[PDB]
Design a protein around this ligand. Structure first.
Ligand SMILES: OC[C@H]1O[C@H](O[C@H]2[C@H](O)[C@@H](O)[C@H](OCCCCC3CCCCC3)O[C@@H]2CO)[C@H](O)[C@@H](O)[C@@H]1O
Ligand SMILES: OC[C@H]1O[C@H](O[C@H]2[C@H](O)[C@@H](O)[C@H](OCCCCC3CCCCC3)O[C@@H]2CO)[C@H](O)[C@@H](O)[C@@H]1O
Ligand SMILES: OC[C@H]1O[C@H](O[C@H]2[C@H](O)[C@@H](O)[C@H](OCCCCC3CCCCC3)O[C@@H]2CO)[C@H](O)[C@@H](O)[C@@H]1O
Ligand SMILES: OC[C@H]1O[C@H](O[C@H]2[C@H](O)[C@@H](O)[C@H](OCCCCC3CCCCC3)O[C@@H]2CO)[C@H](O)[C@@H](O)[C@@H]1O
Ligand SMILES: OC[C@H]1O[C@H](O[C@H]2[C@H](O)[C@@H](O)[C@H](OCCCCC3CCCCC3)O[C@@H]2CO)[C@H](O)[C@@H](O)[C@@H]1O
Ligand SMILES: OC[C@H]1O[C@H](O[C@H]2[C@H](O)[C@@H](O)[C@H](OCCCCC3CCCCC3)O[C@@H]2CO)[C@H](O)[C@@H](O)[C@@H]1O
Ligand SMILES: OC[C@H]1O[C@H](O[C@H]2[C@H](O)[C@@H](O)[C@H](OCCCCC3CCCCC3)O[C@@H]2CO)[C@H](O)[C@@H](O)[C@@H]1O
Ligand SMILES: OC[C@H]1O[C@H](O[C@H]2[C@H](O)[C@@H](O)[C@H](OCCCCC3CCCCC3)O[C@@H]2CO)[C@H](O)[C@@H](O)[C@@H]1O
Ligand SMILES: OC[C@H]1O[C@H](O[C@H]2[C@H](O)[C@@H](O)[C@H](OCCCCC3CCCCC3)O[C@@H]2CO)[C@H](O)[C@@H](O)[C@@H]1O
Ligand SMILES: OC[C@H]1O[C@H](O[C@H]2[C@H](O)[C@@H](O)[C@H](OCCCCC3CCCCC3)O[C@@H]2CO)[C@H](O)[C@@H](O)[C@@H]1O
Ligand SMILES: OC[C@H]1O[C@H](O[C@H]2[C@H](O)[C@@H](O)[C@H](OCCCCC3CCCCC3)O[C@@H]2CO)[C@H](O)[C@@H](O)[C@@H]1O
Ligand SMILES: OC[C@H]1O[C@H](O[C@H]2[C@H](O)[C@@H](O)[C@H](OCCCCC3CCCCC3)O[C@@H]2CO)[C@H](O)[C@@H](O)[C@@H]1O
Ligand SMILES: OC[C@H]1O[C@H](O[C@H]2[C@H](O)[C@@H](O)[C@H](OCCCCC3CCCCC3)O[C@@H]2CO)[C@H](O)[C@@H](O)[C@@H]1O
Ligand SMILES: OC[C@H]1O[C@H](O[C@H]2[C@H](O)[C@@H](O)[C@H](OCCCCC3CCCCC3)O[C@@H]2CO)[C@H](O)[C@@H](O)[C@@H]1O
Ligand SMILES: OC[C@H]1O[C@H](O[C@H]2[C@H](O)[C@@H](O)[C@H](OCCCCC3CCCCC3)O[C@@H]2CO)[C@H](O)[C@@H](O)[C@@H]1O
Lengths: 82, 82, 82, 82, 82, 82, 82, 82, 82, 82, 82, 82, 82, 82, 82
């Protein structure tokens, strides 16, 4: 067990990476998904096309927060300093 | 028992990870779900397709906050420093 | 019977987790629910399908805040440090 | 009568949990309720179905703030530290 | 009579609980009530139904702020610490 | 005459309770009242119904700020500590 | 003359009570008054009814800021501490 | 001929009362006035009724800022403390 | 030439009163004026009535900032303390 | 030549007065001017009337910021303290 | 070369005057200019009238930021204190 | 191992880079993707064209956050200072 | 070389002048340019007139940020103090 | 391995440049891309022209964040001070 | 080989200039570009005129951020002080 400025900064940093990192992607995924289901209601025959394009987009957005998760996990499990 | 800068930072970090981490996904899930039920009212025959696409979307958004939860749980139950 | 930096941080953390954690889900639940009842007025025959999809959505959003509650309850009743 | 950092933090925490915890749910309940009464005006025959879905939604949103209230009451009446 | 960190924090906390606690519910009640009166103008025969659903909703929202008031009153009249 | 941390905190708290406490209710009352007078212009024969429902709603919103006023008056005229 | 932490806090508190206390009611009165004059243009025969309902509404909103004024005047002319 | 904490606080307080106190009323007066002139263009025969209702509304809103002015003038010309 | 806490506070106060005091009224005047010129374009024959109501409104809003200017000039040219 | 708390505060205050003081009037002038040119396109025969009402309005708004400038210039060229 | 609190405050003040001072006018000019070019597209024969009124308005808005520039230049090239 | 001001700043910086860096791109991707799926519903024959343009756009936006990730990874795995 | 409070203030000031100074003009230029290209699509014969008016507008807005640039360059290359 | 105020400031600076630098461009790219795919759905034959203009615009916006990246890389790999 | 207040301020300043300086231009470029591609879909024959006007606009906006880049590069490569 060690406590210093950098261990303290590391745990806070981990939380900020994943917490702040979910704001834009969370909102964005809701916007895209909302238009997708509205589109399916409008044109059910296009569901396959809509679903595929939504899935691609959700993946691009999810990755943004995953970058934050990666930084958090490095800070907690592969910390370069402490 | 143990109290130091890093234990104090850890408990605050845990709260911020899940607290802030729910803001975007919470708003986004509401946006998507709202469009989904609006679409069902418009085209009830499309309910299956709509429900399926919404569920996928809700899972992508839920995962974002779960990343915050995971950081929180690591900080409380598998803390690397303290 | 105990006051230090980490006990003080823990109580504040518990409050921030549930307090901040209800903001996005609270707003999102209202958005989804509002569209659900608008949908029911528009197409009463679809009420069952709308209600089922809404309930699923409300559960996904409620869970987000419950993650904050879980962190808060760990901090108050199973605190790892103090 | 006792005063320390943790008792002071506890009273502030109790207020923040219930205060901040009412923001999203209060706004969301107004949004849902507003669409409900607009829906009843549009289709008075669907009032029973609208009211039932509204009530379910109001409960989900009210619960979010109740989590904040629970934290506040624990901090004030079952404080684990002070 | 008595002044220390905790009495000072208690009076601030009491004000924050009711002050912040009225923001969401205040805005939400206005939104729901505005839709209610618009609905009554649109369909006066639905006034009884609209009024009843509004009353229910106003009570759910009012309760959110009353949680803030309860905390404030505990802090002022049944303070566990000071 | 006495001046200490708690007398100072009490006067500030009193102002914050009543000041912040008027923000949501003030906005909400304007929203509801605006829709009420728009409704009366649309359907003058519904004025009695609209006025009654508006009055009920204005009372619910006014009470939210009154809770803030009560806390302020307790702090200034029935202060538990100073 | 008298200068201490509490006199300094009192003058600032007085300003915040009326200053912040006018924000919501000011915006809300404008919203309501705007809809009222719009309604009069639409249905001049409804002017009496509209004016009456607006006046009631303006009074409910004005009272909110008056509560802030009362706290301010107490702090300056009937201060309980200083 | 006099400088202390309370003289410094008083001058800042005077400025905050009138400065912050003009924000909501300024915006609300513009909203009401804008709808009034739009109403007059729409229905010039109703100009008298619109103007009378606007003037009443402008007075209610102006008063809100005047409360801030009154606090400021008390602080500068009838200061209870300094 | 004198410098103390109160002279420094006085100059800042003067700037805040006039600076902050122009925000709401500036926005509100633009809103009112914009609707006025749109109204004149719609109904050129109502220009006299529109201009008269606009001028009255502009005066009410200008006065709000003038209260801020009065406070600033008192602080600079008739300071009660320094 | 001379540097003390009050000279430092005076230069900051001067900048704040004109800087902040241009925010509302800048936005408001754009709003009014945009409606003016839209109105001229709609009804070119009303150009003279529109231009005159706009000029009057622009002057009311410009004056708001000029109050900020006047304070800044007093602080720089006729400073009562330093 | 001299460095003191007031030289430091002066350079910051200069930047704030011109930086903050461009926010409202920049936004406002874009709003006015956008409506002007939309108007020209709608009625090309009114271009001369539109351009003239836009130019007048752009000048009024540009002057607001120029006041900030003047304060900045006084602070840097005709500083009353340093 | 090593803790100093710069190791502490490095972990915070890494989190800020990826955290803040995902806000704009997250929101932007959702906006573009939502329009894409709406477009596919409108014109399913354009799906290939829409998908290709969306993919290109998603990549431009994803790269923005990847710049944040690159900085974070340099700070953690190739830190020039510590 | 030279380092003191004023050199440090100068470099920060320079950045704030151009950084903050681009916010309003950047947004405003986009608004104006967007309406311009929309107008060209609507009325291609008006392109010359539209382009000319836009160019004038862009120059007025660009100048606002250039004022910030000038302050920045003075602070770096013609600093009056340091 | 070196730590001082400037190395710490450098790492924070690198993160802020790329983090903050992605906000406007990320949002702007989403807006442009969204209109592009909506346009392709409207007029599939214009896809080539739309895609070309989009790509040009995306490059202009991407460059803005790349300036932030360049600053970050200089601070990390070609630091002029430390 | 050099750390002091001004080197630390310089690196932060460089980051703020380009970081903050991209916010408005980034958003404005997206707005203009979005309208351009919408315009092209609407009127493909006007693509050349639209593209030419857009490119001119994008250059004006890009320049605003380049001013921030110039300040940053002066601070890093031609620093007048350190
Ligand atoms: O008190 C003993 C410790 O002293 C140093 O850390 C000190 C540090 O100097 C001091 O500024 C610090 O107080 C500063 C509080 C800053 C809190 C920080 C803000 C954002 C990042 C997360 C939390 O306390 C540390 C306690 O660890 C060393 O880092 C460490 O080696 C040693 O264990
Ligand atoms: O980090 C290691 C050290 O940390 C504590 O020391 C100090 C620490 O230096 C000091 O900055 C700290 O006060 C710093 C204020 C706490 C602010 C911080 C902000 C982020 C969220 C958590 C709260 O108090 C500790 C108690 O005295 C422990 O008491 C000490 O035993 C331990 O060695
Ligand atoms: O173990 C904690 C110990 O911390 C104390 O040191 C410090 C310690 O930073 C803190 O209590 C106090 O500063 C605490 C200020 C920050 C409060 C914190 C902010 C966010 C998280 C919730 C509340 O000052 C003490 C000065 O003695 C003392 O060492 C001791 O009284 C106490 O037991
Ligand atoms: O750790 C508990 C200790 O806390 C008490 O107050 C200490 C405390 O450390 C310190 O932060 C306090 O200043 C606290 C300033 C911030 C208080 C606020 C409370 C809730 C919101 C977050 C932070 O003043 C005292 C310093 O002498 C006393 O030191 C003592 O009664 C007690 O042992
Ligand atoms: O916490 C209990 C202690 O209360 C006092 O602590 C002192 C403490 O040292 C000092 O930092 C504290 O000033 C700290 C200022 C923080 C005020 C706080 C901020 C947010 C919450 C509301 C107000 O004042 C206390 C009251 O005088 C006395 O020291 C003594 O009665 C007792 O030890
Ligand atoms: O200076 C004498 C007084 O000392 C204490 O109060 C001290 C206190 O410790 C100290 O932190 C305080 O300075 C702290 C300033 C905090 C201002 C506070 C912020 C939010 C709440 C309203 C205002 O000054 C007090 C002056 O009364 C005791 O509270 C009081 O018994 C005693 O009269
Ligand atoms: O509260 C009681 C005491 O208060 C004053 O003492 C101190 C006080 O302790 C100290 O914190 C205070 O500085 C505190 C900074 C003021 C901040 C405060 C924030 C809320 C709005 C009002 C301003 O200065 C006073 C002057 O020295 C009086 O000078 C003293 O005579 C009196 O006994
Ligand atoms: O009666 C006030 C007395 O206050 C002084 O103590 C303190 C006092 O807190 C204040 O002046 C100063 O700190 C003042 C900082 C807060 C300024 C305040 C903030 C909001 C309200 C407007 C301005 O430092 C002094 C240090 O001597 C000295 O005791 C004396 O010079 C003065 O007369
Ligand atoms: O109360 C007046 C006294 O104020 C002067 O400045 C004092 C003052 O107390 C203190 O707050 C000041 O720091 C003031 C920091 C905050 C100043 C700012 C001004 C307007 C906006 C709110 C607060 O520095 C000096 C400390 O030595 C000198 O102490 C003296 O010339 C004079 O007697
Ligand atoms: O107020 C007059 C006094 O001016 C000086 O006060 C000192 C004072 O002690 C110190 O706290 C102060 O630093 C306080 C930093 C606050 C700077 C202020 C913040 C907002 C308004 C613009 C800038 O600096 C003053 C200038 O050196 C000198 O002490 C002396 O010339 C005289 O007594
Ligand atoms: O250190 C020597 C200098 O001491 C004084 O200035 C001191 C001053 O008292 C002190 O509060 C100051 O530290 C206070 C830092 C406040 C920074 C300020 C915040 C907003 C306005 C721009 C920057 O450092 C100054 C250094 O010049 C005198 O102003 C000056 O005559 C003298 O050259
Ligand atoms: O900068 C290198 C220095 O690092 C340490 O500095 C100390 C320094 O004195 C102290 O003010 C510092 O506490 C300052 C608190 C600021 C924390 C910072 C805020 C934003 C960026 C992330 C975290 O802590 C350092 C670490 O203990 C040690 O003094 C020593 O290892 C070395 O001289
Ligand atoms: O202003 C004149 C003096 O300024 C410096 O002194 C001091 C100064 O007093 C002190 O407040 C300063 O620390 C103040 C903190 C810096 C904050 C400031 C905020 C605005 C943007 C720039 C950064 O550090 C300097 C270094 O010790 C120089 O080191 C000194 O040689 C020179 O005489
Ligand atoms: O000027 C470089 C010096 O800086 C180091 O850290 C010093 C430094 O002056 C001080 O501000 C530091 O606290 C720094 C607190 C704020 C740090 C943060 C960093 C980036 C974002 C802006 C500000 O702690 C140390 C105090 O002992 C050490 O003093 C020394 O290793 C080195 O010579
Ligand atoms: O020439 C700068 C000198 O400054 C130091 O004094 C001061 C100096 O204010 C600063 O480094 C440190 O405080 C720096 C705090 C502010 C950091 C600043 C904030 C915005 C701009 C970027 C970063 O503490 C030192 C205490 O020694 C020392 O005199 C010396 O270590 C250093 O060389």
């Amino acid at each position: 067990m060690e406590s210093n400025l950098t261990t303290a900064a590391s745990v806070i940093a981990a939380a900020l990476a994943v917490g702040i990192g979910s704001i834009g992607p969370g909102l964005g995924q809701g916007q895209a998904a909302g238009q997708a289901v509205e589109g399916i209601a409008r044109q059910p025959e296009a569901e396959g096309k809509i679903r595929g394009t939504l899935l691609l987009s959700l993946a691009f957005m999810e990755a943004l927060t995953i970058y934050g998760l990666v930084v958090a996990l490095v800070l907690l499990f592969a910390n370069p300093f402490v």
